[PDB]
Every structure is written in structure tokens, then in C-alpha cells.
Design an enzyme around this catalytic site. Structure first.
Site, PDB file in Angstrom:
ATOM      1  N   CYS A  13      -2.627  10.039 -10.711  1.00  0.00           N
ATOM      2  CA  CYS A  13      -2.754   9.139 -11.853  1.00  0.00           C
ATOM      3  C   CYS A  13      -1.754   7.985 -11.834  1.00  0.00           C
ATOM      4  CB  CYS A  13      -2.589   9.945 -13.154  1.00  0.00           C
ATOM      5  SG  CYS A  13      -0.905  10.380 -13.623  1.00  0.00           S
ATOM      6  N   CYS A  18       3.408  15.617  -9.335  1.00  0.00           N
ATOM      7  CA  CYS A  18       2.803  15.560 -10.675  1.00  0.00           C
ATOM      8  C   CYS A  18       3.766  16.169 -11.656  1.00  0.00           C
ATOM      9  CB  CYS A  18       1.505  16.355 -10.692  1.00  0.00           C
ATOM     10  SG  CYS A  18       0.791  16.717 -12.297  1.00  0.00           S
ATOM     11  N   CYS A  71       0.597  13.939  -7.801  1.00  0.00           N
ATOM     12  CA  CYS A  71       0.038  12.978  -8.736  1.00  0.00           C
ATOM     13  C   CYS A  71      -1.114  12.136  -8.157  1.00  0.00           C
ATOM     14  CB  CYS A  71       1.161  12.066  -9.226  1.00  0.00           C
ATOM     15  SG  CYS A  71       0.650  10.902 -10.493  1.00  0.00           S
ATOM     16  N   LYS A 113       0.844  -1.200   0.000  1.00  0.00           N
ATOM     17  CA  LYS A 113       0.000   0.000   0.000  1.00  0.00           C
ATOM     18  C   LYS A 113       0.871   1.238   0.000  1.00  0.00           C
ATOM     19  CE  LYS A 113      -2.515   0.634   3.597  1.00  0.00           C
ATOM     20  NZ  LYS A 113      -3.654   0.334   4.506  1.00  0.00           N
ATOM     21  N   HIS A 124      -0.328  12.878 -16.399  1.00  0.00           N
ATOM     22  CA  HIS A 124      -1.771  12.674 -16.467  1.00  0.00           C
ATOM     23  C   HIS A 124      -2.361  13.025 -17.822  1.00  0.00           C
ATOM     24  CE1 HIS A 124      -1.427  16.885 -14.858  1.00  0.00           C
ATOM     25  NE2 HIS A 124      -2.425  17.100 -15.699  1.00  0.00           N
TER      26      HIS A 124
HETATM   27  S1  FES Z   1      -1.750  13.684 -11.797  1.00  0.00           S
HETATM   28 FE1  FES Z   1      -0.180  12.108 -12.314  1.00  0.00          FE
HETATM   29  S2  FES Z   1       1.385  13.240 -13.434  1.00  0.00           S
HETATM   30 FE2  FES Z   1      -0.211  14.776 -12.988  1.00  0.00          FE
END
Ligand code: FES
Ligand code: FES
Lengths: 64, 67
Positions: free
Chosen positions: A33, A42, A31, A13, A46
Site C-alpha cells: 500500500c 507492513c 507492504c 523505481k 493499509h
Molecule cells: S500493506 Fe502497507 S502497511 Fe500493510
């Protein structure tokens, strides 16, 4: 289906802590994603994910 | 494969902002799985997702020192 394909798969996790007191920047993006090369930050990955899959995910932005 | 199945699908990119000044708690968990019923906050829904899919996702924890 999976959300995270490649990040720290040996970890059952993946949780990241952010020490707010130590933020250098007045705007920092994190991030959501699981594609960023600078994870947990990030890096705009994304956008590629959204283009490839039709998704609409984006980051969490912390503001000072 | 999609990551976000249900959150604001009419929105071309879902971005949330947190003003650090407004964080009440010493520890606050934010969702990275897009399954939380309290999105953008984490409500522990990642655990069900991980159990069902074999995934290993979890939240971002914002830590703020007691003044
Ligand atoms: S939300 Fe994953 S790189 Fe931007
Ligand atoms: S409910 Fe999504 S990371 Fe916890």
C-alpha cells in the site's frame, strides 16, 4: 493517479530485495500500500488507507 | 484515491501468502502496484503505470540462494 505518495520520491523505481535465508520470523508481512512506516515491511497502515478510501489492499505474507 | 482498481474487489482485504519452501526460483518478483495481470506476481505492469502517472513504484524481489 499515484499509488505511492511519499516513499523515496528521488528514486525513479522503488524495488526492494528480500534475502529469504535471513528472515528472522516464521511469518513476515510486506507492504503493498506504500503507507507503512516500516516500508518495505507492513505495519498495518493499509487498514487506515482502506478506511479512508474504501480500498481493500493488504500485504504479502512470507511464511517459513 | 484507490490503489487497487480491479483485483478481487469483492474481497474486503486482499492478502497473499507465500510459503518460502515453494519458491522455485533464485529471484522472484511480486507486485506492489496492483496492475499485474499475474497478481500477486509482478509482470512489469508497474512500468506502464509509472510512465502514465509519474509514479515510482516497483516490485518486491524475493531472493533465495541456490542450495
Ligand atoms: S500493506 Fe502497507 S502497511 Fe500493510
Ligand atoms: S506489475 Fe506491479 S510491481 Fe510490477
Amino acid at each position: 493517479s499515484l499509488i505511492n505518495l511519499k516513499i523515496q520520491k528521488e528514486n525513479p523505481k522503488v524495488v526492494n530485495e528480500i534475502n529469504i535465508e535471513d528472515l528472522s520470523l516464521t511469518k513476515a508481512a510486506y507492504c503493498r500500500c506504500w503507507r507503512s512506516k516500516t516500508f518495505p515491511a507492513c505495519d498495518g497502515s493499509h487498514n487506515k488507507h482502506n478506511e479512508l478510501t474504501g480500498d481493500n489492499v493488504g500485504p504479502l505474507i512470507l511464511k517459513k
